Write a protein that binds this ligand. Structure first.
Ligand SMILES: CC(=O)N[C@@H]1[C@@H](O)[C@H](O[C@@H]2O[C@H](CO)[C@@H](O[C@@H]3O[C@H](CO)[C@@H](O[C@@H]4O[C@H](CO)[C@@H](O)[C@H](O)[C@H]4NC(C)=O)[C@H](O)[C@H]3NC(C)=O)[C@H](O)[C@H]2NC(C)=O)[C@@H](CO)O[C@H]1O
Length: 151
């Protein structure tokens, strides 16, 4: 079915201010706002590929594996491991607090909007070089009463 975001139908002059997405957004009342959303909070660089992963923490439960958590959050468990300085990817412990999500900007270059502001593209660092990647921002960026929000 539809994307959940669809900000682009109700927004114009879509711009990037570094990792921050800015637009003139329509408000319920016929007026306009200028709103910004920090895309570095919502997009990860998943070994060379844009992935929607919200900056968050996850507490390990008994029986979890890094693969399962990888699957639950859609991301390379190898990077979860490095980012959280995990000595052995097969050893995690209940109550362990793992940082996940965001942070694409730190390993991106040539970042720009294409397709009338609907698509973000970048060269993203991977284990072996730089990969060109694009992501449809309407998937998860929405306009609620003139504010850009993740949904
Ligand atoms: C990348 C990936 O996903 N790899 C998978 C492997 O992880 C998985 O093997 C299983 O992995 C889990 C999670 O690490 C593991 O469970 C952990 O096991 C250790 C014991 O070795 C427990 O350690 C103890 O914890 C308690 C407190 O919580 C301490 O008091 C105690 O001292 C610790 N013991 C030691 C020796 O230090 C962890 O608590 C426990 N963690 C969780 C989250 O339950 C399983 O034992 C692994 N299972 C097997 C069969 O090896 C592998 C197979 O499932 O699959 C890979 O894909």
């Amino acid at each position: 079915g539809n994307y959940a975001g669809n900000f682009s139908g109700s927004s114009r002059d879509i711009c990037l201010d570094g990792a921050r997405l800015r637009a003139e957004c329509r408000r319920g009342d016929g007026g306009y706002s200028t709103s910004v959303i920090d895309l570095n909070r919502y997009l990860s660089n998943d070994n060379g590929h844009f992935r929607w992963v919200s900056t968050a923490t996850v507490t390990v439960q008994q029986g979890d594996t890094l693969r399962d958590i990888g699957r639950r959050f859609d991301c390379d468990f190898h990077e979860i491991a490095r980012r959280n300085n995990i000595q052995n990817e097969d050893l995690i412990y209940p109550g362990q607090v793992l940082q996940v999500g965001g942070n694409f900007w730190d390993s991106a270059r040539d970042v720009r909007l294409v397709d009338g502001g609907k698509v973000l593209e970048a060269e993203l660092r991977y284990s072996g070089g730089w990969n060109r990647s694009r992501i449809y921002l309407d998937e998860h960026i929405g306009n609620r009463n003139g504010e850009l929000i993740h949904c």
